[PDB]
Design a protein around this nucleic acid. Structure first.
Ligand SMILES: *C[C@]1(O)C[C@@](C)(OC)O[C@H](/C=C/C(C)=C/C[C@@H]2O[C@H](C)[C@H](NC(=O)/C=C\[C@H](C)OC(C)=O)C[C@@H]2C)[C@H]1O
Ligand SMILES: [Zn+2]
Ligand SMILES: [Zn+2]
Ligand SMILES: [Zn+2]
Lengths: 21, 816, 67, 81
RNA sequence: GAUGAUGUCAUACU
RNA sequence: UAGUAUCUGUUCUUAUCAGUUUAAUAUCUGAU
């Protein structure tokens, strides 16, 4: 479900925020 | 009887004034116009018992005073036979404790004076000039001062000239000089054009045989000088030699009044004469330093504060001549037991440090920081606080620094009461020392930890507050291990049952996290935050605010060590606190929710919020709406609008109204940031503005208003013009909340697109045959005109002349 | 409603244009460059222009119509 | 329902229940300009009281940013009567 | 192709 | 709690003018 991919989505958001900055 | 009929009608009118809604305006207007017909007799006969009624409320008193003012203005010379009786009735009001009671008394008396004239006032008030009772004379003196304020000082000047030199009794001279004093006190700087005349009129009284006349003359000089500050010193030339000689002879309260007059005269002088004169009076002042009577000591302290604050009195003179006896005779433990002496000596000493230098004053009292008398310690600490808050610590050397450290340590350790003065003093001294308190910081944190382990929780609260106050300087001193230990002890004290101390502990923890950082923090964040999670449901606002701010800073700069599920749990608990009454908790909640949304991804929290949006249909839906806006302002809105608009395609309607309300508040909240998202939400707004449901039209108009006001001046004119074409046809809607939202949208669009476009939409129906169309379009025109009157000049259409009138604005048709 | 120059569904053409002209004259006397333009067009001082506009404030569109 | 008299030097206040609210449009977003009220609404026992309920005032009343943009701060004393 | 107005209805949302 | 909206039911001579009112109808008031 979404709970298994929640950490992957958070990591993808952190990677996007690192790439945007 | 006709008089009884008059009485009954006046009674009915006064009743309509006091208890009526309007009715008050009409009744007020008619009683001023019919004043001469009623006569001053029945009017004042009924008004005076009502005015002095013991059960009257303040605003009722203001209403009746306004009634009195109106009826007095038309009734001029008819009030004369009753002025004396009016006076006997009213003059206890002039000494009432209520300030507004005295203002209304002075206003009534001044209106009486301007209605009856100066002649009847002097003729009326003369037999009480030499009355035996002091309070009647005081009332008459205040009344004469207000009369002088009404008719002007020169109009009453010859009466004072005659009365102040009366050969018959000292009471008349005393009353005239008291009149001059009250004139000064009442009119302030307005006495300056006639200040010379008043001083010349009263100056002879200083060498009078009667002591009370000399005293009231000195007090009147002091009042005139205070009112004239900082001007008018030249007008006092002729008074300079008597007073200065008088203090070489008089003693007691007379000498006190003379010195007070001198102390108010000195700051008006230039540097040379101020120097000369304060050197002339310092011997008498220092002699009076040891007087036992407290009023004299207060007055001399006030005078030293005044004279030391004057330009021309050099710092070395104060150093060598003034400071040793001052500190030897005034700074004793006896004077610290009365509040007025306490406050006055503190302010005087601070003004002294303001002029002669901070260290010069500070070094003379630091050791008294270790006196066993706790009240003395509090006084000296407050003095140091005010002095150091004005000037800083740049003047303090190493020796005095160590003296200060030892003194504040001893004062903080031997503390038995929860004094906020000790807390603020410790905090400001340490924060002013800056990186210089670095060698003393171990024992200091030891004492804070000592007070952190006190059996009584209020001492612990004070210690935590001190931690929060000094965390920044402790960081810039680089002692992060003691700070970490402090964080560990506070975390061990997080199960505290008393809410204010726990809130202070949370504030201290926020300070410790801000100074040490999230990576080197002890305890780890992964253990700290779950401990903070159950504290969010506490009902006290201080614990709530502090814990929310702590969670927000943790989410801002140290969210690495916390999983996304714990942050979602925090968000779920935080959502309800957006509707709090206290604005500080709401602001903290907004900040913390934004930090969490910035830290974690948008997708999961946004999904939860949209789910909430669909399954609530209740009051907290707007809470959810606010949270969506927070996500959009803190994170980027392109992470919210796709999912928000894809959820809009479900045909359940109530969800669509929720989406629209969310968009409205979102645009209102993000403001200028929405300028890049007008096109993105334009099709949905097109859909909603043409939908059959009228609630959709109203909320969409709200979105248009918030949008137009948010993007004002950033070039979105065409998209708003397009949305204006869908907002406009709803101007004939009958539902009040809808036409209200339409008018709000039209006003926002007037701001954003300009009044010219709105006027272009308006001009056809301004003179439409249908009255309903004219009502609507003239309402819109009224809104545009009130908002944009001067701009419309450029936007009015060309209206041609006819056979009777000229309608062309020919000036605008000029071409050079 | 208490603001001079606003209107309603019974506003006549004469009153509306009188309001327009008075608003326009006050705007000319406020906006320095409008009055500058007008004082360059004719050959009159700015004070004379201000005087003329003030005399025009009494009846800028002439006497009104009946009914 | 608004007083709408000529405001003076008196500073409008808000109670603890409405701290941060805009008195014209009820919005809580972006306060901008300090509220001034007429002298009659601040006279006597009325000084420092809430401009919405007349209760005790604890903070300064503000017009929101949207109201000042639309010049709704220039319409007179907003004390509700 | 012009669906308005009213209540004893009845049913939904605030 | 009491406000709105949607279905059901009703919705007033295929006999002629004037007056109030209406953007015009409609409504109301009088005469044939
Ligand atoms: C004057 C009052 O009208 C009096 C009274 C009794 O009126 C019924 O109480 C009013 C208070 C109402 C409150 C506090 C309503 C809660 C609302 O909560 C929603 C979710 C909104 N919240 C926000 O806008 C929150 C945060 C914003 C973004 O940030 C800030 C700093 O405000 C609005 C209301 C607060 C009282 O006004
Ligand atoms: Zn007011
Ligand atoms: Zn209030
Ligand atoms: Zn507002």
């Amino acid at each position: 479900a979404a709970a298994a991919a929640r950490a992957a989505r958070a990591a993808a958001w952190r990677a996007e925020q690192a790439a945007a900055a | 009887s006709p008089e009884e009929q008059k009485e009954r009608k006046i009674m009915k009118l006064l009743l309509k004034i006091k208890n009526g809604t309007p009715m008050r305006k009409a009744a007020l207007r008619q009683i001023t116009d019919k004043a001469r017909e009623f006569g001053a007799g029945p009017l004042f006969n009924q008004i005076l018992p009502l005015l002095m009624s013991p059960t009257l409320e303040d605003q009722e008193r203001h209403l009746l005073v306004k009634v009195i003012d109106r009826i007095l203005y038309k009734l001029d010379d008819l009030v004369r036979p009753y002025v004396h009786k009016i006076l006997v009735v009213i003059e206890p009001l002039l000494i009432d404790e209520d300030y507004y009671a005295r203002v209304e008394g002075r206003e009534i008396i001044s209106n009486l004076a301007k209605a009856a004239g100066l002649a009847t006032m002097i003729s009326t008030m003369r037999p009480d000039i030499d009355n035996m009772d002091e309070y009647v004379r005081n009332t008459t003196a205040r009344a004469f001062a207000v009369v002088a304020s009404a008719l002007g000082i020169p109009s009453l000047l010859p009466f004072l000239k005659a009365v102040c030199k009366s050969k018959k009794s000292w009471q008349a001279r005393h009353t005239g000089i008291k009149i001059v004093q009250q004139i000064a006190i009442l009119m302030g700087c307005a006495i300056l054009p006639h200040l010379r005349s008043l001083v010349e009129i009263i100056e002879h009284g200083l060498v009078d045989e009667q002591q009370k006349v000399r005293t009231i003359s000195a007090l009147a000089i002091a009042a005139l000088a205070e009112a004239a500050t900082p001007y008018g010193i030249e007008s006092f030339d002729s008074v300079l030699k008597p007073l200065w000689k008088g203090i070489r002879q008089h003693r007691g309260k007379g000498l006190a009044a003379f010195l007070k007059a001198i102390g108010y005269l000195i700051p008006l002088m230039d540097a040379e004469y101020a120097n000369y004169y304060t050197r002339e009076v310092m011997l008498i002042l220092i002699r009076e330093f040891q007087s036992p009577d407290e009023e004299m000591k207060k007055i001399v302290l006030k005078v030293v504060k005044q004279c030391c604050g004057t330009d021309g009195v050099e710092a070395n003179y104060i150093k060598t001549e003034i400071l040793p006896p001052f500190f030897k005779h005034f700074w004793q433990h006896r004077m610290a037991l009365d509040r007025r002496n306490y406050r006055q000596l503190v302010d005087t000493t601070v003004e002294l440090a303001n002029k002669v230098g901070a260290a010069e004053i500070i070094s003379r009292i630091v050791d008294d920081l270790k006196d066993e008398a706790e009240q003395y310690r509090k006084m000296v600490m407050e003095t140091i606080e005010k002095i150091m808050g004005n000037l800083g610590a740049a003047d303090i050397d190493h020796k005095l620094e160590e003296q200060l450290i030892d003194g504040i340590l001893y004062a903080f350790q031997e503390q038995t009461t929860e004094d906020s003065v000790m807390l603020n003093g410790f905090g400001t001294v340490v924060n002013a020392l800056g990186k210089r308190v670095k060698p003393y910081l171990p024992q200091i944190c030891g004492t804070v930890l000592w007070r952190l382990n006190n059996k009584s929780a209020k001492v612990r609260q004070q210690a935590a507050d001190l931690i929060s106050r000094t965390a920044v300087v402790m960081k810039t001193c680089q002692e992060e291990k003691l700070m970490g230990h402090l964080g560990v002890v506070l975390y061990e004290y997080l199960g505290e049952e008393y809410p204010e101390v726990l809130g202070s502990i949370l504030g201290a923890l926020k300070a410790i996290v801000n100074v040490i950082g999230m990576h080197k923090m002890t305890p780890p964040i992964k253990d700290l935050l779950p401990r903070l999670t159950p504290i969010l449901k506490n009902r006290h606002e201080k614990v709530q605010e502090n814990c929310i701010d702590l969670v927000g800073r943790i989410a801002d700069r140290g969210a690495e060590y916390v999983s996304a599920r714990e942050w979602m749990r925090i968000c779920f608990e935080l959502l309800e606190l957006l509707k709090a009454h206290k604005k500080a908790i709401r602001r903290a909640t907004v900040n913390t929710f934004g930090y969490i949304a910035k830290a974690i991804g948008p997708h999961d929290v946004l999904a939860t919020l949209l789910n909430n949006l669909k399954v609530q249909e209740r009051q907290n839906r707007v809470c959810t709406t606010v949270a969506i806006a927070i996500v959009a302002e803190t994170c980027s809105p392109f992470t919210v609008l796709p999912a928000l608009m894809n959820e809009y395609r479900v045909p359940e309607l109530n969800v669509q109204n929720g989406v629209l309300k969310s968009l409205s508040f979102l645009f209102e909240y993000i403001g200028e940031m929405g300028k890049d998202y007008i096109y993105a939400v334009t099709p949905l707004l097109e859909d909603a503005l043409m939908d059959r449901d009228l609630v959709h039209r109203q909320t969409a108009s709200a979105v248009v208003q918030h949008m137009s006001l948010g993007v004002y001046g950033f070039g979105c004119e065409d998209s708003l013009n397009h949305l204006l074409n869908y907002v406009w046809p709803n101007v004939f809607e009958t539902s009040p909340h809808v036409i209200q939202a339409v008018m709000g949208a039209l006003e926002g669009l007037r701001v954003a697109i300009g009044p010219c476009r709105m006027l272009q939409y308006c001009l056809q129906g301004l003179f439409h045959p249908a009255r309903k169309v004219r009502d609507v379009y003239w309402k819109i025109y009224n809104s545009i005109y009130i908002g944009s009157q001067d701009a419309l000049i450029a936007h009015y259409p060309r209206i041609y002349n006819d056979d009777k009138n000229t309608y062309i604005r020919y000036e605008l048709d000029y071409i050079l | 409603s208490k603001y001079i120059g606003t209107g309603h569904a019974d506003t006549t053409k004469w009153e509306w244009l009188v309001n327009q002209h008075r608003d326009s004259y006050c705007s000319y006397m406020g906006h320095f460059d409008l009055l500058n333009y007008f004082a360059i067009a004719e050959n009159e001082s700015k004070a004379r222009v201000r005087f003329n506009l003030m005399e025009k404030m009494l009846q800028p569109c002439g006497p009104p119509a009946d009914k | 329902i608004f007083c709408r008299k000529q405001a003076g030097v008196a500073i409008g206040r808000l109670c603890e229940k409405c701290d941060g609210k805009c008195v014209i449009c009820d919005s809580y977003v972006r306060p901008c300009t300090l509220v001034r009220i007429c002298d009659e609404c601040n006279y006597g026992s009325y000084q420092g009281r809430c401009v919405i309920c007349g209760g005790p005032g604890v903070s300064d009343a503000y017009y929101c940013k949207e109201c000042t943009i639309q010049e709704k701060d220039r319409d007179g004393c907003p004390k509700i009567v």
